Design a protein around this ligand. Sequence first.
Ligand SMILES: [Cu+2]
Ligand SMILES: [Cu+2]
Ligand SMILES: [Cu+2]
Ligand SMILES: [Cu+2]
Length: 495
Amino acid sequence: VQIGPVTDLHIVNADIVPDGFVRPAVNAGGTFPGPVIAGNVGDNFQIVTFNQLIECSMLVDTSIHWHGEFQKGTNWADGPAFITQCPIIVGNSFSYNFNVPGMAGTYWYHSHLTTQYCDGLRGPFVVYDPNDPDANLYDVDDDTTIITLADWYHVLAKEMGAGGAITADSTLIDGLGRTHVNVAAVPLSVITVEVGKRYRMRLVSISCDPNYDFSIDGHDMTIIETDGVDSQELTVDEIQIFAAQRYSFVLNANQPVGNYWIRANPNSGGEGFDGGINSAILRYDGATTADPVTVASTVHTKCLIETDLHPLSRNGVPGNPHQGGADCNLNLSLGFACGNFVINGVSFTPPTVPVLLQICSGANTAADLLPSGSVISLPSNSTIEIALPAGAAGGPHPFHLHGHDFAVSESASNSTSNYDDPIWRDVVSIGGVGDNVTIRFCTDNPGPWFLHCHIDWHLDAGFAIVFAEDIPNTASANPVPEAWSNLCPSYDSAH
Ligand SMILES: [Cu+2]
Ligand SMILES: [Cu+2]
Ligand SMILES: [Cu+2]
Ligand SMILES: [Cu+2]
């Protein structure tokens, strides 16, 4: 279902059984995944989030992030708990009121408090471009062509331990799928196509953890969008999609009428497709209603390599064409030890006062801000470079920056930098030991912006820092509604 751009969104508890196993959940909009929130580029979004949570097992507080939305001038509406706001308490509501100028494409929204989004609060967010340069490449782009991939757990997030290797109990495609262990024959999702039509498939990772090897038996996929960024056409037969990444791909339904397996193999949890785990069904109108009997190609011959992607627009790369050819170039030490992750030797633990409130209250520099050593200040209108050399315990880590997208100057498993025409995106795999994934952006958005691994269990384990961008201009750029100012007093009073 699609709602927005002006909408209510109730946050409720519900037991659900997507793989046949009932357990508690925290749901946005009553459903799993949440309803698609949609608008057109430049629209004003006004999302009234009513917190009606009762089940403490998964926390009754909440806070919602709009993933890949820049939130310029509205840092207060970003969502990360104790970064830009205190959580909303049960019984209250809060209006996320923001614009999306300049942005179109496929996004998502999730709880940004603790590991709550694992427990169900996740859904797609699409900004339609009425002048999409890609439009002519397909016949169908609508709610039926959104494909979410979700890891699902039989153990409540709050009880995961942590960390501590944690693994999912099934893979859900459009909210249905089968349990990895003692697989029960429960309903699979169907994606219906018509012979000869081309589809804009919007592939959304709403994963708390695993990355997926995504493929469709017998069919090609032509990538045209990555994390909101129109790309030149790239035809692949497999897509490794990491947590919180998005791709639009054109599917040309050019195979014989029939049933074809859709496959999403996670990097942990159940391996293979026995009993139809890691599966959904691509069904042609006119096919018998039966499970597919198709097989994957023994070797995928054109799998997505990220260095093959290039922006549709002439984005280029900011700054100078050599490592550290930036106004402010950074290299972070990313570590894991004794169950916790560190950035520059500091594991992230959420502050009592949100970083935004700290700045609004009078803080002027990173040194003034809590948590100590968990904030790096950035000057305005400056080319930033961030190298994120991998090696920390598993891995591969999908790093994500709030309030910005970025040029991927260096990709996973390839030590050749691209300062000419690399894809821009908002979440990127930093690959493996010896890799040196590197990103560049320009500081044109004052506010405290989260940078973290998007494996939620790793975020909770402290793999995060805040870029406090243009601290002196942060209050003037981001005026707050009284409801925002009411959040922390209500929250602290209740706790
Ligand atoms: Cu996110
Ligand atoms: Cu985000
Ligand atoms: Cu990680
Ligand atoms: Cu985040």
